[PDB]
């Protein structure tokens, strides 16, 4: 029975979407990446919707709303994979119908990116990350996304402050045994940022190599980096 912003982000959390890899297409690197880029395109729509439930996000200018999402979108996608993967060992749950082990990662050419995502999984598993913390960190990653293009720096700082205050209140209430738990959660964000950079670089390379079709929204978010 905790912080109201945390409560709200929990009920704002979107429903899972399925990858639905085309069962008429033969299994290949191109099929795996096409499947993952299609899933990312669809999850970006859901993410834009979610961001509007984040208290105060909708009061920013449309330019600032776009700036935060263009900076943070891959971090938010990664955190979803991470959260879904916490009850697994050495597997990434991209979706309930798309669980990637080492074998599938090698076949997709994603072994290095997927190993970095697994390092995030193993850290949050050792901290026993709760859904409450997951949704709060997702929002903080959006607010703290270091865009060079913000118009109202004070308004974005205020959003950062509101969500950080929510995280601190939740940990103070729920995790009295570890007075440093909120800071330990914030100290996971550098590896999240690092992994997002590697993922965006990787998918940018795939876009240039021209062999994997990609939807308009995914390509626009990739172009913005």
């Amino acid at each position: 029975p905790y912080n109201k912003i945390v409560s709200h982000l929990l009920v704002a959390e979107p429903e899972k979407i399925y990858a639905m890899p085309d069962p008429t297409v033969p299994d290949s690197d191109i099929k795996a990446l096409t499947t993952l880029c299609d899933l990312a395109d669809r999850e970006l729509v859901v993410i834009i919707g979610w961001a509007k439930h984040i208290p105060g996000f909708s009061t920013l200018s449309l330019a600032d709303q776009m700036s935060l999402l263009q900076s943070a979108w891959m971090e938010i996608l990664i955190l979803g994979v991470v959260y879904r993967s916490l009850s697994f060992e050495d597997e990434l749950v991209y979706a309930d119908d798309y669980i990637m082990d080492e074998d599938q990662s090698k076949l997709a050419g994603l072994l290095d990116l997927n190993n970095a995502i697994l390092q995030l999984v193993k850290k949050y598993k050792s901290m026993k990350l709760e859904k409450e913390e997951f949704v709060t960190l997702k929002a903080i990653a959006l607010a703290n996304s270091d865009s060079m293009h913000i118009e109202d720096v004070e308004a974005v700082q205020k959003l950062q402050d509101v969500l950080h205050e929510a995280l601190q209140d939740y940990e103070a209430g729920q995790h009295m045994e570890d007075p440093r738990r909120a800071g330990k959660m914030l100290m996971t964000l550098p590896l999240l940022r690092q992994t997002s950079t590697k993922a965006v670089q990787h998918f940018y390379n795939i876009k240039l190599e021209g062999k994997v079709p990609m939807h308009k929204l995914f390509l626009e978010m990739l172009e913005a980096k």
């Binding site: 729509v45 834009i48 919707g49 449309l62 999402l69 929204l217 626009e220 978010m221 913005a224």
Partner: peptide
């Protein structure tokens, strides 16, 4: 113009 903007203005 951007689909991101479109979806931010939508519904």
């Amino acid at each position: 113009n951007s689909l991101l903007l479109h979806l931010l203005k939508s519904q």
